[PDB]
Structure 1
């Protein structure tokens, strides 16, 4: 279904705040923003899609994403907050794309 202005703004907000939360987690963990992002995304999408990312220095497999997920869940409450923010951020990204999929058709039909 198409997004109401409120819904659109909400999802966009969750996305932006999500990216910010990934940056924050990069600050705290001392880890790579890319690696963390890929892990969060992997957990949101599930084990269905797991693959090596060209930019990552480490091959991404269930083992590695599990270790990183556990190193994320081993944070204090106020730090662990940003993990939830990030998760819901990725989910919101997914829904935003899936909702705006029609615009692409309406534009592409002219090309």
Structure 2
């Protein structure tokens, strides 16, 4: 019943979503270099706020303990960048 709640995509919605996913990963790679940070850690910090703070935990492989303290600090550097960045 719960998977019948999501309508299935049309060919354009499918390619739209697929489109944005890949472009989003290219986004995060370049944000590693601007920032001097680590793509995986940026990946999880981007990840955190889309899902909500419902899910926040330590992710295996990341160097920092991922708690609201560090995701706030890392998010506000992310937002401290020029508008083109």
Q: Which gives a bigger RCO, structure 1 or 2 (Cα 8 Å, sep 6+)?
A: 1
Deviations 1:26-74 (CA, angstroms, capped at 9, x unpaired)? 0100101011110000010111000001111111000100000000000
Match of 2:43 among 32, 37, 41: 37
* Unpaired runs of at least 5, structure 1: 79-110
Q: Which runs of 4+ in 1 moved over 3 A?
A: none
* Unpaired runs of at least 5, structure 2: 1-6
Give the aligned length.
Answer: 79
Query: Partner of 2:33: helix, strand, or coil?
Result: helix
Say if 2:16 is the partner of 1:15.
no
- Aligned-residue CA RMSD in angstroms? 5.4
The answer to which structure has the higher helix fraction is 1
